[PDB]
Each structure stands twice: as structure tokens, then as C-alpha cells.
């Protein structure tokens, strides 16, 4: 996260890390058996690491569970990143405690202005790279689809929201993909793509989760 803070213990319990050797993306726990991430984070073989904080040392409070099902949104487009959302069903339910917990799907969409908390173990340098052991957090508002489109033209579809600052300096970055953008206690975004990190006039584009709630419902109940 470029320019955010160390999150503090048991602050972000739905944060999930996707591992296949090492952290390559993050995700959110949405119920004891299903994690939501981004479709471009797909691998066959993903190990979900739950209750993580320092991902570099084992602190005995973590749960590592293999993914049994990895399902990318059917209409996901690898070139335009539209419908960038993926559901992972865990081969065993995570035991929910303080360190491990569920985010809620949206009662509705966020309105331009709402502040949110973005979180991840991704890079912390817009120019260069440092990869933090500890989970980084960032407060940022949802931008207007109008700002979002003017910032990235011909690219922002109606399933993508920009969250961040037009003046740069604070943003999600590589390693954060798939992570949560939680606003008012509801998961409104998934970190997806962007032009570089924390650049001026380039805010993060996140998958608009309010558009997919019934798909999520439908897949969880049908699998």
C-alpha cells in the first residue's frame, strides 16, 4: 500500500493472503467457507492463509486451508479486466474467532465520497519496491465515476470504481490485488489494476462488488 499505516492487531480479520509458494495476491473471507478475490489472481493451486499479520513469521494464530474450488467470474476479460472477481471455496471452513472473520456483502453501492479502508501486503513504494511484513491499511474515499472515467478514458466500465486520491501519494500497489476495499463495514471493492502506483491523477481501479452480489449468492448456493 503506498503511503498507508501498519494495520494493528486484529483490525482487519477478513483479510486473506493467497499463497502458491509465496504471497501473490490477497482476498476477503465472506463466510466460513468462501473467499472472494480478483479473477486475474487465478492459479490452479492456491493456499489460503487466514489470521495473518506479519506474513513473514509464524505467530501460531494462523489458519492455512487449501482452496478446493477456484471459480473466475464467467465474463471476466483478461484484456479489459472487466468482471475481475473470483470465488475460492475452502476445502475446510475457517474456524471463526477474533483473528479470523467474515466481511459483509453490500446492502447497496458506495456513493462517491464514502471513505473506505483498503489493506494488503503489497509494495509500499510508487517509485521502487519495498514489501512489508505487516499488513498495511489505507483510508481513501470512493471517487466519482466521472473523475474515474476522466482519469482512465475508454477503460473504466460500469463494474469498476476508482478509490484513492487524484493528487497521488496514497494507493494500493502490486501485491495488493484481490484485497478488500471495505466501506461502512461492507465489502465495496476488490483491488484490481491501475496505471503505476500512487501516481498523480491515477487512482486505483477496483472491481465494483455491489454489481455481483447475486452472482456471489448464486455460486455459493449452487456449489
Amino acid at each position: 500500500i503506498v503511503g498507508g499505516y501498519t494495520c494493528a492487531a486484529n483490525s482487519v480479520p477478513y483479510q486473506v493472503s493467497l499463497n502458491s509458494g509465496s504471497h501473490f495476491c490477497g482476498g476477503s473471507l465472506i463466510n466460513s467457507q468462501w473467499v472472494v478475490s480478483a479473477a486475474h489472481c487465478y492459479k490452479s493451486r492456491i493456499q489460503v492463509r487466514l489470521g495473518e499479520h506479519n506474513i513473514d513469521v509464524l505467530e501460531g494464530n494462523e489458519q492455512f486451508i487449501n482452496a478446493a474450488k477456484i471459480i473466475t467470474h464467467p465474463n471476466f476479460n483478461g484484456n479489459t479486466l472487466d468482471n475481475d472477481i473470483m470465488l475460492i471455496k475452502l476445502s475446510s471452513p475457517a474456524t471463526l474467532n477474533s483473528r479470523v472473520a467474515t466481511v459483509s456483502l453490500p446492502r447497496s453501492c458506495a456513493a462517491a465520497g464514502t471513505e473506505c479502508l483498503i489493506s494488503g501486503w503489497g509494495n509500499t513504494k510508487s517509485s521502487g519496491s519495498s514489501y512489508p511484513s505487516l499488513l498495511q491499511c489505507l483510508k481513501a474515499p470512493v471517487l466519482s465515476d466521472s473523475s474515474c472515467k476522466s482519469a482512465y478514458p475508454g477503460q473504466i466500465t460500469g463494474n469498476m470504481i476508482c478509490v484513492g486520491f487524484l493528487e497521488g501519494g496514497k494507493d494500493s500497489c502490486q501485491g495488493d490485488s484481490g484485497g478488500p476495499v471495505v466501506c461502512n463495514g461492507q465489502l465495496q471493492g476488490i483491488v484490481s489494476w491501475g496505471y503505476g502506483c500512487a501516481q498523480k491523477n491515477k487512482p486505483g481501479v477496483y472491481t465494483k462488488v455491489c454489481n455481483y452480489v447475486n452472482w456471489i449468492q448464486q455460486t455459493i448456493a449452487a456449489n
Binding site: 502490486q174 490485488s177 491501475g194
Partner: protein
Amino acid sequence: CCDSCDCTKSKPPQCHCANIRLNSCHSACKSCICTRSMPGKCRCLDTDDFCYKPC
């Protein structure tokens, strides 16, 4: 450098490079989108009226 390039059939052609590359697009590229994975899947959204490099 570019392997896949999609040009319109205009004089001059409007060309795009379709390659998703590893962590990078190129150094000649002013419109590079990357996913925020580790590594990033990056694509150069540049348009050039003729179709070669970006490098």
C-alpha cells in the same frame, strides 16, 4: 518487442499492442496498465499510427 498488434484499416492505421507482459510493458509506452498482483500482468494501451515498437 510487440508480438500481437491490432491495427485498424485506415490510412494511417491506428495501432494497439495486445501483449500482456510480465511486470512491465516497455520503456516506450506512455499508457501502461498493470494489475496489482505479484507479479503484475501489464499491458501498454498506446496508440500509434503504424505498428512496431514500444520497447
